[PDB]
């Protein structure tokens with residue numbers, strides 16, 4: 144059903160995903176852990192929305208479990224250094240993912256920086272959804288797991304958070320690996336990211352990935368449960384871009400109050416294009 | 432009531448306990464934590480499995496770290512909590528050494544008898560202090576910010592003599608004065624290995640036991656507590672048996688997997704009485 148170029152396009156994306164996604168997080172080490180005016184009132188309401196407990200299962204069978212403090216002053220920033228290290232590690236895998244794709248490495252190094260800069264959060268969330276357990280509200284990251292804390296309204300209150308609603312909605316679609324990796328490609332090759340110069344070239348690339356996704360779905364999903372699935376996916380990607388803008392502003396408000404971002408994260412935000420992104424520029428020039 | 436010599440005897444023991452028992456464990460810091468020949472090994476596995484506890488660490492901000500031990504998979508995994516317990520035992524024993532140094536009857540003994548008594552009573556006095564922070568309802572030793580909770584495997588727990596001791600002793604609901612008198616009777620044991628002033632230590636132990644017996648007769652409703660003193664003495668006899676069983680237990684583990692601190696090494700037979708106990712000798716002369 145798929146064309147030969149579309150089959151090869153899916154094969155390269157799937158191969159890149161396998162080579163660059165550490166699903167067991169076995170190489171995630173040396174991370175930080177919680178030790179053994181209205182800007183504050185605005186910041187406090189953001190962190191509590193996505194409260195998680197941290198669990199670490201050792202290779203021997205032991206389990207360390209961290210329950211966060213129940214308050215809202217600097218105790219709300221206890222897990223941010225760890226989540227920053229976790230986010231940075233996921234982003235380095237995202238950078239490697241883009242470097243393996245032939246359509247990406249042929250772009251100018253400044254556009255490669257701009258595309259990764261604008262899609263860092265989005266591709267991280269797409270990979271996070273593949274390890275999200277919707278029944279337990281837990282992201283299962285190999286030895287580490289992040290379990291959402293219960294609340295009064297239960298499922299109702301937590302779903303008001305658009306980031307959590309995105310993960311539950313996307314998980315309900317029961318996407319295949321091929322559909323996830325095509326979403327990552329469509330988000331990565333966004334022609335309207337700030338700083339992009341080859342707008343038309345990136346725009347032509349994005350359209351071919353979307354056409355391939357539509358063709359893949361029509362060849363492998365006949366059930367009425369998957370009606371309009373391609374348009375649902377494209378709608379989810381538009382929603383994810385909106386969530387990216389809102390959560391980037393949350394982080395900068397928190398970085399204002401309590402600095403926590405890693406040097407690579409600081410490059411992604413605001414905290415010569417190659418001069419302001421020395422780490423990303425180096426990682427893009429290195430091999431894999 | 433008590434005689435004047437017996438009332439002052441209890442006052443000195445309570446004074447020593449107050450000054451040397453960190454009941455909140457506020458000064459227990461910088462301890463190690465679990466990170467993130469087959470015949471001798473076969474016995475060691477059966478040794479550690481009986482007393483498995485989860486470690487809970489409460490932070491000043493309200494957060495809680497909890498450690499669940501791994502199940503026996505046949506390796507060095509069953510040694511995960513030994514560095515931490517070695518640090519806890521070392522900290523408790525330094526408080527036990529300071530407790531004995533406050534007692535006038537103990538300072539008047541030769542330094543070699545002081546070493547032998549503390550060496551033989553180290554485990555016993557530590558368990559006696561541990562029982563005062565043991566919550567029998569939850570099976571947890573509450574050590575300030577630290578908690579050690581017995582892992583569910585109750586009738587089966589009572590097969591282990593160490594756990595049966597803490598449940599039975601806690602059920603007696605002893606006073607602070609009765610606990611510290613138990614510590615004195617255990618500390619002044621004349622039949623410890625290496626003791627030379629047998630007659631002097633025996634007479635001291637008898638005076639403490641008579642003081643405890645007289646304290647119970649005067650401060651508790653008779654005849655309801657008619658046999659409480661004999662129950663306490665029976666608990667002390669069982670504790671001496673548990674001490675010998677777990678000393679041999681530690682030696683077997685230390686042989687295949689060294690974990691004991693330098694002060695612990697002096698407590699057991701790990702390598703003149705003062706020459707083989709230079710740390711203990713130093714802590715006693717300071």
Ligand SMILES: CCC[C@H](CC)Oc1ccc(C(=O)OC)cc1NC(=O)c1nnn(-c2cc(OC)ccc2OC)c1C
Pocket residue numbers: 190193194195222223226227230231234263264267271282284289306307390391394408411
């Ligand atoms: C494995 C966890 C999955 C779950 C999915 C929602 O995630 C969390 C759960 C809980 C918390 C939390 O309890 O907070 C203390 C925070 C996050 N999530 C980020 O911490 C985070 N996710 N993405 N990014 C990010 C990364 C960037 O490039 C490196 C750029 C911008 C970013 O965000 C604006 C961050 C900091």
Ligand SMILES: CCC[C@H](CC)Oc1ccc(C(=O)OC)cc1NC(=O)c1nnn(-c2cc(OC)ccc2OC)c1C
Pocket residue numbers: 482483484512513516517519520521523524553554557558561572579593677678681698
């Ligand atoms: C802190 C909670 C109290 C609880 C009471 C049973 O304690 C444990 C809980 C759990 C374990 C455990 O899960 O095992 C890895 C082990 C012990 N208990 C000792 O670790 C231990 N208690 N006393 N001593 C010791 C000390 C000596 O000098 C003071 C001399 C000899 C000793 O033993 C032969 C040790 C090593």
